[PDB]
């Protein structure tokens, strides 16, 4: 099985450590699948593998014990990098109204698949990543970029349903 | 692609709905992979698929808008049943010291693969599911069955290291 699809992918991105005390392991490989497989199994890493980057140029994995939401870690844009975050370390429940939610649930509560944020079909809208930097309006993930009440939501791919809330649990239970 | 391995599998287990109003969807297939593909892609399902069960006698998927932790639903035994739970709806962060943690993390903070609980190798112990019922000492997941200071831990597959705490973040972080 290919463990690559079990990760949250963010194209053209890598991560940089502000605090350089945080450990890292690198290696040249061929495909990103190799980085995924290694990371998932965690065999060969003196730490818990939370995320990795595949350098497409150098053909190289960079395995991290941290991810984009870790303190003292910055995202950086780069044409050759693909970021892959292990979903186990992307909080899959919400605090409050869920403005900080970054998980990959992309289905509404009646079970309609979400429309991508940067598509205008079926529904036209202004909720684009450029209007909400840091709110992760990517793919078709359930989000609440304005921090409104009702929790994370999305435009549904049902022409007859403009938007619907998603059913994402609170961490409080 | 093959999604079945993206679920927490509980063997010999099904879920009975106690709440009379609760939705359930079922169909006859050959293998459980079919149930998993259907669940993940959430296709032809009037709810959000949080878990399914494969009946090996009937050769039949049962899809659920709930899982084993949902209120109004009971875990129940049967040799013919296998319970697959969508990892997006098992809290992946710990509240307090982690006694209620039911996630699938199974690596110690220093990268060691956990020894399965019901194994005696490399390390003999007494943390058997049969004397910790309710605490999900299954497979080799990090657990904290006595709710001790230190959070979830496991016995490790490394003969040199009996046990190690795991690195599972607090929901508030
Ligand atoms: O709400 S459910 O209980 O899921 N209802 C389903 C139906 O959607 C399905 O058409 C029938 C026949 O399918 S089969 O499995 O008997 O072949 O079975 C069950």
UniProtKB/Swiss-Prot annotation, chains A, B:
Transmembrane feature ranges: none
Disulfide bonds: 35-61, 39-49, 93-171, 114-154, 142-166
Domain Kringle: 93-171
PAN domain sequence ranges: 2-88
Protein name: Hepatocyte growth factor alpha chain
Source organism: Homo sapiens (Human)
Gene name, Swiss-Prot/TrEMBL: HGF
């Amino acid at each position: 099985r290919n463990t690559i699809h079990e990760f949250k992918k963010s194209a053209k991105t890598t991560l940089i450590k502000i605090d350089p005390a945080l450990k890292i392991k690198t290696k040249k490989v061929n495909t990103a699948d190799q980085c995924a497989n290694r990371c998932t199994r965690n065999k060969g890493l003196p730490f818990t593998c939370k995320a990795f980057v595949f350098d497409k140029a150098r053909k190289q994995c960079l395995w991290f014990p941290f991810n984009s939401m870790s303190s003292g870690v910055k995202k950086e844009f780069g044409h050759e990098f693909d970021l892959y975050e292990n979903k186990d370390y992307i909080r899959n429940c919400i605090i409050g109204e869920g403005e900080s939610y970054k998980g990959t649930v992309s289905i509404t509560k009646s079970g309609i698949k979400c429309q991508p944020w940067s598509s205008m079909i079926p529904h036209e809208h202004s909720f684009l990543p450029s209007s909400y930097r840091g709110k992760d309006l990517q793919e078709n993930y359930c989000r609440n970029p304005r921090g409104e009440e009702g929790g994370p939501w999305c435009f549904t791919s049902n022409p007859e349903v403009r938007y619907e809330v998603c059913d994402i649990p609170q961490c409080s239970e």
